[PDB]
Amino acid sequence: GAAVAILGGPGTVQGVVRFLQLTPERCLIEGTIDGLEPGLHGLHVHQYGDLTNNCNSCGNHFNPDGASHGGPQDSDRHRGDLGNVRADADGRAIFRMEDEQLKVWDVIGRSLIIDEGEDDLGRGGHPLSKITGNSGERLACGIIARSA
Amino acid sequence: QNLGAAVAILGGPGTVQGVVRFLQLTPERCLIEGTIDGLEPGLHGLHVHQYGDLTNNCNSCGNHFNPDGASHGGPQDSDRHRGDLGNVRADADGRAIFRMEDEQLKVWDVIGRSLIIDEGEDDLGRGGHPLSKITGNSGERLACGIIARSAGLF
Ligand SMILES: [Zn+2]
Ligand SMILES: [Zn+2]
């Protein structure tokens, strides 16, 4: 399957992220997000795509396996933990990745969200490291939709 | 509880907008409730389309959600699309408030897809119009929302 997520939020920060399930156990994720402060910004899929209350109603990190926060490449990680994304000097974050635990059929209807700052991939030894990665505040989210 | 919920915030090319929530009471009953404002008073077709891609506004949503390859019809017709929710009447203040059940539309089907409100009435495939058995000829799409997974108000 194929998907897309139109990000946005309070003021700056907004972009587009598409998902394409190339095969039954590996997914391609490509997207661009402008308006971000140069530097790393965590990226995660949250349980819901309900933006009624903006990104506050998006629920928490999509985590079916009941794991703990981790890195994309980590094993013990939330299915929705896409780790970080780097916003170059221009404040533009462009990326492409092949996460193989996050499937298009498992995240449609949900949401993609970028945070204030860097995700410490559950290794920051902060009360929130193992929970969110202490990525800070959610500044942009989009509902992961079905696409052609 | 196993009550699946989905919410669809409507936004578009015009004034029209609202929120429609979906609730899968039982596997055969899906409560659909919503309020859409900014509509001209009168009937307005409501359908679930196959894609939720709003990258090209309400155009990239594709067509009405129609797995069974049926033709367009009213919400109560057997020969209809799964996403055919039929009409929705916006009152004098240009507001559409509606609550209804649909036993053919399942929450788990429409997630990720989109809810669209049309310019005009849905002839429910009986207009004898080239588009009747396709779109019900409900006119143009003035607003659409991406059906999203939701907690649901309990
Ligand atoms: Zn996480
Ligand atoms: Zn139809």
Side-chain angles (χ1 to χ4, degrees):
Chain A
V4 185
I6 293 176
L7 288 181
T12 62
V13 189
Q14 67 198 338
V16 179
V17 185
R18 336 200 65 112
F19 304 67
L20 178 43
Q21 210 50 45
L22 302 149
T23 69
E25 19 67 46
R26 74 198 183 191
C27 175
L28 193 67
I29 300 168
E30 298 145 306
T32 284
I33 311 171
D34 306 312
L36 299 155
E37 295 286 291
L40 294 176
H41 285 66
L43 197 73
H44 332 273
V45 173
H46 287 212
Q47 205 196 316
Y48 322 100
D50 174 341
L51 306 173
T52 281
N53 186 201
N54 297 147
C55 308
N56 282 182
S57 25
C58 287
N60 307 326
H61 287 186
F62 181 46
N63 184 207
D65 309 312
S68 55
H69 187 65
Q73 310 155 65
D74 261 318
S75 56
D76 175 39
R77 63 124 175 164
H78 299 155
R79 312 238 284 221
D81 300 333
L82 306 176
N84 295 296
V85 151
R86 166 163 279 93
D88 67 6
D90 284 298
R92 184 176 189 187
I94 294 181
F95 62 76
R96 159 178 300 181
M97 55 171 300
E98 197 176 315
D99 184 283
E100 53 187 62
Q101 199 183 304
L102 191 78
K103 319 296 192 311
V104 169
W105 68 76
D106 197 27
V107 312
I108 54 188
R110 304 186 187 289
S111 71
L112 197 53
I113 309 188
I114 7 175
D115 302 324
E116 204 175 319
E118 175 186 359
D119 176 323
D120 70 43
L121 315 183
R123 304 178 187 179
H126 177 280
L128 300 165
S129 300
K130 291 296 186 168
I131 311 189
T132 56
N134 201 30
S135 295
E137 185 160 291
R138 308 173 185 172
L139 46 70
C141 59
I143 311 171
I144 312 180
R146 297 177 185 288
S147 208
Chain B
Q1 179 51 48
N2 299 308
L3 294 197
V7 59
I9 304 180
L10 290 193
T15 319
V16 180
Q17 66 182 41
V19 173
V20 173
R21 307 197 95 91
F22 298 77
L23 187 58
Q24 196 67 57
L25 299 171
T26 77
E28 318 76 44
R29 290 167 68 181
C30 182
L31 173 60
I32 284 178
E33 310 179 307
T35 295
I36 311 178
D37 299 319
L39 288 155
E40 296 292 300
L43 295 195
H44 286 82
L46 184 62
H47 319 93
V48 173
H49 291 219
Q50 27 182 45
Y51 308 109
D53 187 320
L54 295 188
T55 224
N56 182 183
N57 267 170
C58 305
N59 292 156
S60 40
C61 302
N63 294 293
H64 298 183
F65 176 59
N66 166 223
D68 320 308
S71 54
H72 183 76
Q76 302 186 62
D77 288 318
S78 47
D79 184 4
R80 58 95 148 183
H81 297 160
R82 299 268 270 286
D84 286 340
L85 300 178
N87 291 306
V88 142
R89 163 190 163 300
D91 66 20
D93 310 294
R95 124 169 309 192
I97 282 172
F98 55 95
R99 190 180 189 295
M100 79 235 272
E101 286 212 308
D102 198 279
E103 49 193 59
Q104 198 194 296
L105 190 71
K106 302 287 166 297
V107 176
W108 61 72
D109 279 328
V110 308
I111 277 185
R113 308 185 177 297
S114 58
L115 182 53
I116 296 179
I117 177 73
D118 289 326
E119 194 210 314
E121 174 179 355
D122 191 331
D123 61 39
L124 312 179
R126 317 188 183 189
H129 180 100
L131 301 168
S132 298
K133 304 291 182 169
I134 301 171
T135 83
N137 197 30
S138 290
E140 207 159 289
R141 308 171 182 177
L142 39 69
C144 58
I146 310 175
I147 301 172
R149 300 172 183 293
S150 188
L153 320 183
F154 298 147

PDB file of all heavy atoms in Angstrom, chain A residues 36-58:
ATOM      1  N   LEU A  36      11.457  24.076  10.103  1.00  0.00           N
ATOM      2  CA  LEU A  36      12.111  23.496  11.268  1.00  0.00           C
ATOM      3  C   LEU A  36      13.459  24.146  11.556  1.00  0.00           C
ATOM      4  O   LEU A  36      14.203  24.497  10.641  1.00  0.00           O
ATOM      5  CB  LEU A  36      12.326  22.001  11.056  1.00  0.00           C
ATOM      6  CG  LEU A  36      11.103  21.112  10.852  1.00  0.00           C
ATOM      7  CD1 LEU A  36      11.516  19.878  10.090  1.00  0.00           C
ATOM      8  CD2 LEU A  36      10.494  20.738  12.181  1.00  0.00           C
ATOM      9  N   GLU A  37      13.770  24.292  12.840  1.00  0.00           N
ATOM     10  CA  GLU A  37      15.037  24.868  13.276  1.00  0.00           C
ATOM     11  C   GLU A  37      16.161  23.945  12.835  1.00  0.00           C
ATOM     12  O   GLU A  37      16.065  22.729  12.986  1.00  0.00           O
ATOM     13  CB  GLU A  37      15.061  24.981  14.795  1.00  0.00           C
ATOM     14  CG  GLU A  37      14.047  25.952  15.347  1.00  0.00           C
ATOM     15  CD  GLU A  37      14.454  27.388  15.113  1.00  0.00           C
ATOM     16  OE1 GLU A  37      15.439  27.825  15.749  1.00  0.00           O
ATOM     17  OE2 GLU A  37      13.800  28.073  14.293  1.00  0.00           O
ATOM     18  N   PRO A  38      17.240  24.506  12.271  1.00  0.00           N
ATOM     19  CA  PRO A  38      18.326  23.622  11.848  1.00  0.00           C
ATOM     20  C   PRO A  38      18.616  22.660  12.989  1.00  0.00           C
ATOM     21  O   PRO A  38      18.516  23.039  14.154  1.00  0.00           O
ATOM     22  CB  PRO A  38      19.476  24.594  11.598  1.00  0.00           C
ATOM     23  CG  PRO A  38      18.760  25.816  11.092  1.00  0.00           C
ATOM     24  CD  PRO A  38      17.595  25.921  12.059  1.00  0.00           C
ATOM     25  N   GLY A  39      18.942  21.416  12.663  1.00  0.00           N
ATOM     26  CA  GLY A  39      19.229  20.454  13.710  1.00  0.00           C
ATOM     27  C   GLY A  39      18.247  19.305  13.729  1.00  0.00           C
ATOM     28  O   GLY A  39      17.229  19.333  13.038  1.00  0.00           O
ATOM     29  N   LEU A  40      18.554  18.291  14.530  1.00  0.00           N
ATOM     30  CA  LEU A  40      17.712  17.106  14.644  1.00  0.00           C
ATOM     31  C   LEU A  40      16.348  17.338  15.304  1.00  0.00           C
ATOM     32  O   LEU A  40      16.220  18.083  16.280  1.00  0.00           O
ATOM     33  CB  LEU A  40      18.461  16.011  15.412  1.00  0.00           C
ATOM     34  CG  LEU A  40      19.702  15.422  14.739  1.00  0.00           C
ATOM     35  CD1 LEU A  40      20.355  14.436  15.683  1.00  0.00           C
ATOM     36  CD2 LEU A  40      19.315  14.746  13.424  1.00  0.00           C
ATOM     37  N   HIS A  41      15.331  16.693  14.748  1.00  0.00           N
ATOM     38  CA  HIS A  41      13.971  16.771  15.264  1.00  0.00           C
ATOM     39  C   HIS A  41      13.409  15.362  15.218  1.00  0.00           C
ATOM     40  O   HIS A  41      13.400  14.729  14.168  1.00  0.00           O
ATOM     41  CB  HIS A  41      13.098  17.679  14.395  1.00  0.00           C
ATOM     42  CG  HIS A  41      13.359  19.139  14.582  1.00  0.00           C
ATOM     43  ND1 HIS A  41      14.550  19.734  14.234  1.00  0.00           N
ATOM     44  CD2 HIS A  41      12.569  20.130  15.062  1.00  0.00           C
ATOM     45  CE1 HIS A  41      14.483  21.029  14.489  1.00  0.00           C
ATOM     46  NE2 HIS A  41      13.292  21.296  14.992  1.00  0.00           N
ATOM     47  N   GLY A  42      12.956  14.863  16.358  1.00  0.00           N
ATOM     48  CA  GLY A  42      12.393  13.530  16.384  1.00  0.00           C
ATOM     49  C   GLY A  42      11.152  13.394  15.510  1.00  0.00           C
ATOM     50  O   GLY A  42      10.426  14.363  15.243  1.00  0.00           O
ATOM     51  N   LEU A  43      10.902  12.169  15.072  1.00  0.00           N
ATOM     52  CA  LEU A  43       9.765  11.878  14.213  1.00  0.00           C
ATOM     53  C   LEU A  43       9.132  10.578  14.706  1.00  0.00           C
ATOM     54  O   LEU A  43       9.827   9.589  14.936  1.00  0.00           O
ATOM     55  CB  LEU A  43      10.253  11.716  12.767  1.00  0.00           C
ATOM     56  CG  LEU A  43       9.242  11.785  11.634  1.00  0.00           C
ATOM     57  CD1 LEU A  43       8.794  13.227  11.442  1.00  0.00           C
ATOM     58  CD2 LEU A  43       9.890  11.261  10.370  1.00  0.00           C
ATOM     59  N   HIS A  44       7.816  10.572  14.875  1.00  0.00           N
ATOM     60  CA  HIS A  44       7.153   9.371  15.361  1.00  0.00           C
ATOM     61  C   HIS A  44       5.734   9.281  14.841  1.00  0.00           C
ATOM     62  O   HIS A  44       5.148  10.282  14.433  1.00  0.00           O
ATOM     63  CB  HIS A  44       7.096   9.388  16.890  1.00  0.00           C
ATOM     64  CG  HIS A  44       8.204  10.162  17.527  1.00  0.00           C
ATOM     65  ND1 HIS A  44       9.427   9.605  17.834  1.00  0.00           N
ATOM     66  CD2 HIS A  44       8.291  11.469  17.870  1.00  0.00           C
ATOM     67  CE1 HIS A  44      10.219  10.533  18.338  1.00  0.00           C
ATOM     68  NE2 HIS A  44       9.555  11.674  18.370  1.00  0.00           N
ATOM     69  N   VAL A  45       5.187   8.071  14.845  1.00  0.00           N
ATOM     70  CA  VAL A  45       3.808   7.881  14.438  1.00  0.00           C
ATOM     71  C   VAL A  45       3.070   7.708  15.757  1.00  0.00           C
ATOM     72  O   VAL A  45       3.492   6.938  16.622  1.00  0.00           O
ATOM     73  CB  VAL A  45       3.596   6.617  13.572  1.00  0.00           C
ATOM     74  CG1 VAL A  45       2.109   6.402  13.333  1.00  0.00           C
ATOM     75  CG2 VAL A  45       4.301   6.767  12.236  1.00  0.00           C
ATOM     76  N   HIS A  46       1.990   8.461  15.927  1.00  0.00           N
ATOM     77  CA  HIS A  46       1.203   8.372  17.138  1.00  0.00           C
ATOM     78  C   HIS A  46      -0.034   7.531  16.875  1.00  0.00           C
ATOM     79  O   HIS A  46      -0.434   7.337  15.723  1.00  0.00           O
ATOM     80  CB  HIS A  46       0.864   9.769  17.649  1.00  0.00           C
ATOM     81  CG  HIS A  46       2.038  10.476  18.254  1.00  0.00           C
ATOM     82  ND1 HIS A  46       1.918  11.380  19.290  1.00  0.00           N
ATOM     83  CD2 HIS A  46       3.363  10.394  17.982  1.00  0.00           C
ATOM     84  CE1 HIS A  46       3.117  11.820  19.631  1.00  0.00           C
ATOM     85  NE2 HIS A  46       4.010  11.237  18.853  1.00  0.00           N
ATOM     86  N   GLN A  47      -0.639   7.015  17.939  1.00  0.00           N
ATOM     87  CA  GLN A  47      -1.778   6.137  17.761  1.00  0.00           C
ATOM     88  C   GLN A  47      -2.896   6.643  16.880  1.00  0.00           C
ATOM     89  O   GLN A  47      -3.341   5.907  16.004  1.00  0.00           O
ATOM     90  CB  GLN A  47      -2.358   5.709  19.100  1.00  0.00           C
ATOM     91  CG  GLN A  47      -3.094   4.391  18.970  1.00  0.00           C
ATOM     92  CD  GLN A  47      -4.007   4.100  20.136  1.00  0.00           C
ATOM     93  OE1 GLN A  47      -3.637   4.300  21.294  1.00  0.00           O
ATOM     94  NE2 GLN A  47      -5.211   3.611  19.834  1.00  0.00           N
ATOM     95  N   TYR A  48      -3.345   7.883  17.099  1.00  0.00           N
ATOM     96  CA  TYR A  48      -4.452   8.452  16.313  1.00  0.00           C
ATOM     97  C   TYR A  48      -4.098   9.600  15.357  1.00  0.00           C
ATOM     98  O   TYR A  48      -3.062  10.254  15.484  1.00  0.00           O
ATOM     99  CB  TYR A  48      -5.581   8.948  17.240  1.00  0.00           C
ATOM    100  CG  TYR A  48      -5.867   8.100  18.462  1.00  0.00           C
ATOM    101  CD1 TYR A  48      -5.375   8.467  19.717  1.00  0.00           C
ATOM    102  CD2 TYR A  48      -6.640   6.946  18.376  1.00  0.00           C
ATOM    103  CE1 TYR A  48      -5.651   7.704  20.858  1.00  0.00           C
ATOM    104  CE2 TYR A  48      -6.918   6.175  19.506  1.00  0.00           C
ATOM    105  CZ  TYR A  48      -6.422   6.559  20.746  1.00  0.00           C
ATOM    106  OH  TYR A  48      -6.703   5.809  21.874  1.00  0.00           O
ATOM    107  N   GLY A  49      -4.995   9.844  14.407  1.00  0.00           N
ATOM    108  CA  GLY A  49      -4.803  10.924  13.457  1.00  0.00           C
ATOM    109  C   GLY A  49      -5.795  12.038  13.757  1.00  0.00           C
ATOM    110  O   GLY A  49      -5.959  12.986  12.983  1.00  0.00           O
ATOM    111  N   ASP A  50      -6.464  11.909  14.899  1.00  0.00           N
ATOM    112  CA  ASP A  50      -7.446  12.878  15.351  1.00  0.00           C
ATOM    113  C   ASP A  50      -6.816  14.221  15.711  1.00  0.00           C
ATOM    114  O   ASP A  50      -6.276  14.385  16.794  1.00  0.00           O
ATOM    115  CB  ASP A  50      -8.168  12.320  16.568  1.00  0.00           C
ATOM    116  CG  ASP A  50      -9.117  13.317  17.192  1.00  0.00           C
ATOM    117  OD1 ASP A  50      -8.977  14.525  16.929  1.00  0.00           O
ATOM    118  OD2 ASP A  50      -9.998  12.888  17.964  1.00  0.00           O
ATOM    119  N   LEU A  51      -6.922  15.194  14.815  1.00  0.00           N
ATOM    120  CA  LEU A  51      -6.352  16.513  15.053  1.00  0.00           C
ATOM    121  C   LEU A  51      -7.358  17.500  15.653  1.00  0.00           C
ATOM    122  O   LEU A  51      -7.110  18.703  15.704  1.00  0.00           O
ATOM    123  CB  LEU A  51      -5.807  17.074  13.744  1.00  0.00           C
ATOM    124  CG  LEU A  51      -4.812  16.204  12.988  1.00  0.00           C
ATOM    125  CD1 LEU A  51      -4.505  16.816  11.632  1.00  0.00           C
ATOM    126  CD2 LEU A  51      -3.557  16.058  13.815  1.00  0.00           C
ATOM    127  N   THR A  52      -8.498  16.988  16.093  1.00  0.00           N
ATOM    128  CA  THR A  52      -9.535  17.817  16.699  1.00  0.00           C
ATOM    129  C   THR A  52      -8.908  18.832  17.648  1.00  0.00           C
ATOM    130  O   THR A  52      -9.257  20.011  17.639  1.00  0.00           O
ATOM    131  CB  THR A  52     -10.534  16.946  17.466  1.00  0.00           C
ATOM    132  OG1 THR A  52     -11.445  16.338  16.542  1.00  0.00           O
ATOM    133  CG2 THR A  52     -11.307  17.761  18.433  1.00  0.00           C
ATOM    134  N   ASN A  53      -7.976  18.365  18.470  1.00  0.00           N
ATOM    135  CA  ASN A  53      -7.280  19.236  19.406  1.00  0.00           C
ATOM    136  C   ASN A  53      -5.852  19.433  18.889  1.00  0.00           C
ATOM    137  O   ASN A  53      -4.919  19.611  19.655  1.00  0.00           O
ATOM    138  CB  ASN A  53      -7.257  18.600  20.806  1.00  0.00           C
ATOM    139  CG  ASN A  53      -6.674  19.525  21.872  1.00  0.00           C
ATOM    140  OD1 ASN A  53      -6.233  19.063  22.919  1.00  0.00           O
ATOM    141  ND2 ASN A  53      -6.679  20.828  21.613  1.00  0.00           N
ATOM    142  N   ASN A  54      -5.691  19.405  17.575  1.00  0.00           N
ATOM    143  CA  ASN A  54      -4.376  19.572  16.986  1.00  0.00           C
ATOM    144  C   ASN A  54      -3.531  18.321  17.224  1.00  0.00           C
ATOM    145  O   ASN A  54      -4.019  17.199  17.088  1.00  0.00           O
ATOM    146  CB  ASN A  54      -3.698  20.802  17.581  1.00  0.00           C
ATOM    147  CG  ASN A  54      -4.453  22.072  17.272  1.00  0.00           C
ATOM    148  OD1 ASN A  54      -4.479  23.013  18.071  1.00  0.00           O
ATOM    149  ND2 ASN A  54      -5.071  22.111  16.098  1.00  0.00           N
ATOM    150  N   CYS A  55      -2.268  18.503  17.580  1.00  0.00           N
ATOM    151  CA  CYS A  55      -1.412  17.354  17.798  1.00  0.00           C
ATOM    152  C   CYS A  55      -1.548  16.799  19.209  1.00  0.00           C
ATOM    153  O   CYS A  55      -0.911  15.804  19.549  1.00  0.00           O
ATOM    154  CB  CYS A  55       0.049  17.716  17.499  1.00  0.00           C
ATOM    155  SG  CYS A  55       0.337  18.488  15.858  1.00  0.00           S
ATOM    156  N   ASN A  56      -2.384  17.435  20.029  1.00  0.00           N
ATOM    157  CA  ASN A  56      -2.589  16.981  21.403  1.00  0.00           C
ATOM    158  C   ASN A  56      -3.540  15.800  21.488  1.00  0.00           C
ATOM    159  O   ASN A  56      -3.535  15.055  22.465  1.00  0.00           O
ATOM    160  CB  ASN A  56      -3.132  18.111  22.268  1.00  0.00           C
ATOM    161  CG  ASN A  56      -2.060  19.087  22.682  1.00  0.00           C
ATOM    162  OD1 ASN A  56      -2.329  20.043  23.413  1.00  0.00           O
ATOM    163  ND2 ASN A  56      -0.832  18.854  22.224  1.00  0.00           N
ATOM    164  N   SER A  57      -4.355  15.631  20.456  1.00  0.00           N
ATOM    165  CA  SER A  57      -5.318  14.533  20.405  1.00  0.00           C
ATOM    166  C   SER A  57      -4.774  13.338  19.626  1.00  0.00           C
ATOM    167  O   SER A  57      -5.441  12.316  19.473  1.00  0.00           O
ATOM    168  CB  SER A  57      -6.628  15.024  19.774  1.00  0.00           C
ATOM    169  OG  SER A  57      -6.413  16.134  18.915  1.00  0.00           O
ATOM    170  N   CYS A  58      -3.543  13.465  19.157  1.00  0.00           N
ATOM    171  CA  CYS A  58      -2.936  12.412  18.382  1.00  0.00           C
ATOM    172  C   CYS A  58      -2.563  11.184  19.184  1.00  0.00           C
ATOM    173  O   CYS A  58      -2.164  10.172  18.615  1.00  0.00           O
ATOM    174  CB  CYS A  58      -1.723  12.959  17.636  1.00  0.00           C
ATOM    175  SG  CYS A  58      -2.182  14.031  16.260  1.00  0.00           S
TER     176      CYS A  58
END
